[PDB]
Amino acid sequence: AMSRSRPELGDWSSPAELAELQRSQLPRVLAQALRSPFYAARYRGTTPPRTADDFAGVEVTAKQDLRDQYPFGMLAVGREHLATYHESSGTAGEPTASYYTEEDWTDLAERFARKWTGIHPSDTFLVRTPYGLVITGHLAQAAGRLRGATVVPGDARSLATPLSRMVRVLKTLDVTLTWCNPTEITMLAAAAKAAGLRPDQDFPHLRAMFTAAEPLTEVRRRRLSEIWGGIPVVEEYGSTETGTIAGQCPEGRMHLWADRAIFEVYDPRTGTLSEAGRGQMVVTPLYRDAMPLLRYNLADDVEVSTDPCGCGWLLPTVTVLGRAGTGHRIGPATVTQQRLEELVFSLPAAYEVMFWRAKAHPDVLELEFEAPEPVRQRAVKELGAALDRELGVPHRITGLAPGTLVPAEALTAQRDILKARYLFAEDEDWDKAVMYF
Amino acid sequence: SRPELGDWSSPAELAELQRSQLPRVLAQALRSPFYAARYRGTTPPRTADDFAGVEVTAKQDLRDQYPFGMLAVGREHLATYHESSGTAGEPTASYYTEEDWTDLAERFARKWTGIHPSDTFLVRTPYGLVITGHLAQAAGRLRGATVVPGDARSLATPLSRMVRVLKTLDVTLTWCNPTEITMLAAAAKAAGLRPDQDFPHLRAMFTAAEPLTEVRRRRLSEIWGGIPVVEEYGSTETGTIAGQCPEGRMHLWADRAIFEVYDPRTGTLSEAGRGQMVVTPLYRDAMPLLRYNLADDVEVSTDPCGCGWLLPTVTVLGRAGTGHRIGPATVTQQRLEELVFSLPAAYEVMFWRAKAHPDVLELEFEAPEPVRQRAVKELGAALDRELGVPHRITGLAPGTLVPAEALTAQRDILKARYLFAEDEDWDKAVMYF
Ligand SMILES: Nc1ncnc2c1ncn2[C@@H]1O[C@H](COP(=O)(O)OP(=O)(O)NP(=O)(O)O)[C@@H](O)[C@H]1O
Ligand SMILES: Nc1ncnc2c1ncn2[C@@H]1O[C@H](COP(=O)(O)OP(=O)(O)NP(=O)(O)O)[C@@H](O)[C@H]1O
Ligand SMILES: Nc1c(O)cccc1C(=O)O
Ligand SMILES: Nc1c(O)cccc1C(=O)O
Ligand SMILES: [Mg+2]
Ligand SMILES: [Mg+2]
Ligand SMILES: [Mg+2]
Ligand SMILES: [Mg+2]
Ligand SMILES: [Zn+2]
Ligand SMILES: [Zn+2]
Numbered sequence A: 001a002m003s004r005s006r007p008e009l010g011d012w013s014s015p016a017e018l019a020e021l022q023r024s025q026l027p028r029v030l031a032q033a034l035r036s037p038f039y040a041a042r043y044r045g046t047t048p049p050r051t052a053d054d055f056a057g058v059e060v061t062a063k064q065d066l067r068d069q070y071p072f073g074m075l076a077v078g079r080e081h082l083a084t085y086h087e088s089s090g091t092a093g094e095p096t097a098s099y100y101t102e103e104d105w106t107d108l109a110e111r112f113a114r115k116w117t118g119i120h121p122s123d124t125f126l127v128r129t130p131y132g133l134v135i136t137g138h139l140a141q142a143a144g145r146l147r148g149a150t151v152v153p154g155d156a157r158s159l160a161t162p163l164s165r166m167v168r169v170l171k172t173l174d175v176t177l178t179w180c181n182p183t184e185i186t187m188l189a190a191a192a193k194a195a196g197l198r199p200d201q202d203f204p205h206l207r208a209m210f211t212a213a214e215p216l217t218e219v220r221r222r223r224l225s226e227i228w229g230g231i232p233v234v235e236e237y238g239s240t241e242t243g244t245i246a247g248q249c250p251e252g253r254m255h256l257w258a259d260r261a262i263f264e265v266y267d268p269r270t271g272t273l274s275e276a277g278r279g280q281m282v283v284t285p286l287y288r289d290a291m292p293l294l295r296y297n298l299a300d301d302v303e304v305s306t307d308p309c310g311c312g313w314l315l316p317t318v319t320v321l322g323r324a325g326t327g328h329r330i331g332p333a334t335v336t337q338q339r340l341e342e343l344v345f346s347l348p349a350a351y352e353v354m355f356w357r358a359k360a361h362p363d364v365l366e367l368e369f370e371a372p373e374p375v376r377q378r379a380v381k382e383l384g385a386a387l388d389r390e391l392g393v394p395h396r397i398t399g400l401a402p403g404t405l406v407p408a409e410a411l412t413a414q415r416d417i418l419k420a421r422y423l424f425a426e427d428e429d430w431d432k433a434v435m436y437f
Numbered sequence B: 001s002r003p004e005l006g007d008w009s010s011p012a013e014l015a016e017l018q019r020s021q022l023p024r025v026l027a028q029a030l031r032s033p034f035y036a037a038r039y040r041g042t043t044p045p046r047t048a049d050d051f052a053g054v055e056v057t058a059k060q061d062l063r064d065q066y067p068f069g070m071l072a073v074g075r076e077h078l079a080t081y082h083e084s085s086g087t088a089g090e091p092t093a094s095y096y097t098e099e100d101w102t103d104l105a106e107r108f109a110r111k112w113t114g115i116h117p118s119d120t121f122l123v124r125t126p127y128g129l130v131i132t133g134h135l136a137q138a139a140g141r142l143r144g145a146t147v148v149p150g151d152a153r154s155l156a157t158p159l160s161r162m163v164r165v166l167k168t169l170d171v172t173l174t175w176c177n178p179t180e181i182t183m184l185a186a187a188a189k190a191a192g193l194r195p196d197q198d199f200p201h202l203r204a205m206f207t208a209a210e211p212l213t214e215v216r217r218r219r220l221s222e223i224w225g226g227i228p229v230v231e232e233y234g235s236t237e238t239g240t241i242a243g244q245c246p247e248g249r250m251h252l253w254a255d256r257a258i259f260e261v262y263d264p265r266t267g268t269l270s271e272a273g274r275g276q277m278v279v280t281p282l283y284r285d286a287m288p289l290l291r292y293n294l295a296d297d298v299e300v301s302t303d304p305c306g307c308g309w310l311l312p313t314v315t316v317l318g319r320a321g322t323g324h325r326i327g328p329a330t331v332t333q334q335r336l337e338e339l340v341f342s343l344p345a346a347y348e349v350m351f352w353r354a355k356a357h358p359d360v361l362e363l364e365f366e367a368p369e370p371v372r373q374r375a376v377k378e379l380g381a382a383l384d385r386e387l388g389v390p391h392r393i394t395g396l397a398p399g400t401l402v403p404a405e406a407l408t409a410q411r412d413i414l415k416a417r418y419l420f421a422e423d424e425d426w427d428k429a430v431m432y433f
Helices: A015-023 A026-033 A039-043 A053-057 A062-069 A100-114 A136-147 A163-172 A180-193 A218-227 A336-343 A373-390 A407-413 B011-019 B021-027 B033-038 B059-062 B096-106 B132-143 B159-168 B176-191 B214-223 B332-340 B370-385 B402-406
Strands: A085-087 A097-100 A126-127 A149-155 A177-179 A208-211 A233-239 A243-248 A254-256 A262-268 A277-285 A296-305 A317-323 A356-360 A365-370 A395-400 A423-425 B080-083 B092-096 B120-123 B146-149 B173-175 B203-206 B229-235 B241-244 B248-250 B256-264 B271-279 B292-300 B311-314 B350-358 B362-365 B391-396 B419-420
Touching: A026 A053, A026 A097, A062 A296, A097 A100, A100 A136, A100 A233, A100 A243, A126 A136, A136 A149, A163 A180, A163 A233, A163 A407, A177 A395, A180 A208, A180 A218, A180 A407, A180 B256, A208 A218, A218 A233, A218 A336, A233 A254, A243 A277, A296 B059, A296 B092, A317 A336, A317 A356, A317 A373, A317 A423, A336 A356, A336 A373, A373 A395, B011 B271, B059 B292, B092 B096, B096 B241, B120 B159, B159 B176, B159 B402, B176 B214, B176 B402, B203 B214, B214 B229, B214 B332, B229 B248, B241 B271, B256 B292, B332 B350, B332 B362, B362 B370, B370 B391
Parallel strands: A085 B146, A126 A149, A126 A177, A149 B080, A177 A208, A208 A233, A356 B419, A365 A395, A423 B350, B120 B146, B120 B173, B173 B203, B203 B229, B362 B391
Antiparallel strands: A085 A097, A233 A243, A243 A254, A254 A317, A262 A277, A277 A296, A296 A317, A356 A365, B080 B092, B229 B241, B241 B248, B248 B311, B256 B271, B271 B292, B292 B311, B350 B362
């Protein structure tokens, strides 16, 4: 290929050709991995892996290995070559570090930008994930810049950008693309309604919503689409340590970006690695210098299939069920978030049920949800019938007043972006002197 | 393309570098709805000489033109969109092409201490609509420094986590406002780390976004072991318009913008003196500004500096310069700040606040036991000696103005969860931040 050194969708015409694209990179990848303290330590007294054939024998890298190596045990280049440093979501007490060169970032930005809806200079792209240490906001911004879209840095979890300000931006800037988790898609819808705007009609320029970071059932995804006027909700799957490892096709399935990484399914019982099936997601990225990973186990429970899709992409599909869990068992029946989510989001759209939570007791499933008063009793009865029909678990279902789970102030409150002030006039509130956020 | 420090050898040469750009700048400004409307049915300004007659652009004009009244290019050419800090009710939009961003990043990167690939740069200003975080990150990337995106006002990045990062990543440079420099020092002590000794790799602290006296700046330096605190002056609408030299004065980046001092009364514009900061950026396409009044109270001087940079210096009073009549006398935040930060460093007085009553100055500050009573008496003597205003000074326990929880609280970065085990807290289901 003229003028580019990493593969694109179309560079292989068969799974045999895809496999050759991968194995060709393994000598470079294996040489780079040995340059890091962690892999140099791992292969100390022995002969290390050097060839594509040697890769079959390579030991898995666990999350706990990355935490033990905090901060730069996994670093394979001089620190002068790093562009950005990031840490994972989850526990603050046991951080996981990731870091990337400028060239590593081109691979990251390309993988995010594989959005079947496209990202164009004509787009105004609201980035509504965090920029605080996590990679998510930086990744969407970098892909927006790569493709020439106007980036509106919404951030998320920032006091500067409450939902009321994000609704105003969505409408007044004619935003065409959003990036945020699926719960944030419903929070934005609720904040729109609280501002007197219909998500299904009053945002005519909004053409797609990019999402990730949560297990997302097709039933919930299609409801999120319907709330926002039937526009595409385009899912990806990623981690701080790997970048984007799978993206949605127009048929609504996520495909693994296998041209940019070797993907394997790990069976905890047998300790075997397969190219498809049910088990834990293992990733060997092929196009990074700073933080080489050999068979890094994300420990996400996944279903990988090589079975063809209506989209015709020559890549396996992946479903992400969730993380390692004991499964929540209520008698002979096993309840998953995924199964309850399907039942909750199968309620008629007219009931406006978006916010809910459940607790597994040994004897009973406790479930609460917000619904407007008129439809609340119908919703409780219909969701009870669904649990009886699909799970047969004992349940205590409670319908709640709006503003109970998601407070009205989260949806409507505006916050001035203040700065430190030390001297105040008599009539001014000096409570904002030093704690001004 | 764009000038560098050293491309001019005299003020006459600097002025020619500026005037050479004005035809292009005046032509670009007329492409925006605002300036096309302003000069409708007239012949517009076209030449460097015509610029002397150009009408000032007020903040209120930018708010009236929200969102894209100031836009001079197709939206396809914009790279990023930003809004100012301050009032949420009346937003001020700014926006930049990729090429506009190279000018922004260059001006921020004019840090006399340098920004190098050997640096680990903690960016501790917001990324939420405001430009501040994005600007420091862009300059870090331009100069090859490892950027650690701390963000600010984010629930993901509390002070306790930022102190842990400062220490464990051997951070060499920080970017945050001056109050945040003291908040990080207080959080460091709460984490068991001495700011003046336990961060040996920290070599400079970059700061902006509030009026900063040299007495306070020198104290912030001393708290962090005597390392340079390097000030700049900027806005969302202009980018960085002035930076500190090694002598500790801010110099205007006049090669990249025409700087004028505005007298509100007469409406007259001078190249130096006391008045409101007016800026014409020279190297932007998306959002041209002709004599944009920041309405910041400034003192501009053409007096030569020991640093040898051929650029005028600027002091920013802003709001900190506006007098409150109390006793017989007029007190400014700037003057009180000098007295508060003239207390001995060993008293650890960093957090304070005052209220101007018609009759008396009410002032509170934190000081640990057992220096609190010395501090109250000494600050009272200083106010008597320097201002002679009546005062009620109260010393407070640490944790009173800046709560211990702000300094020590750790926060897991949770995601939405819908199904919980019996023993788990399900209050984090949908409100997980
Ligand atoms: N589309 C998706 N579907 C399901 N889960 C997803 C999806 N996208 C991301 N995730 C989850 O988010 C994780 C990546 O988040 P990241 O912040 O890197 O780490 P963390 O797992 O939250 N923290 P830690 O366990 O300490 O490593 C993935 O491993 C998945 O568990
Ligand atoms: N070093 C500094 N010293 C003093 N003030 C500063 C300094 N750096 C920035 N500022 C102030 O911060 C302002 C830039 O903040 P910005 O968010 O662009 O606008 P704002 O003035 O807060 N909002 P608005 O009044 O609506 O335009 C400058 O105009 C100054 O008032
Ligand atoms: N969800 C993610 C993604 O899609 C790409 C990169 C990182 C993440 C994440 O959750 O951290
Ligand atoms: N203070 C600032 C700076 O120095 C550069 C750019 C923006 C700002 C700001 O505070 O708005
Ligand atoms: Mg570096
Ligand atoms: Mg692998
Ligand atoms: Mg654009
Ligand atoms: Mg402003
Ligand atoms: Zn498909
Ligand atoms: Zn100087």
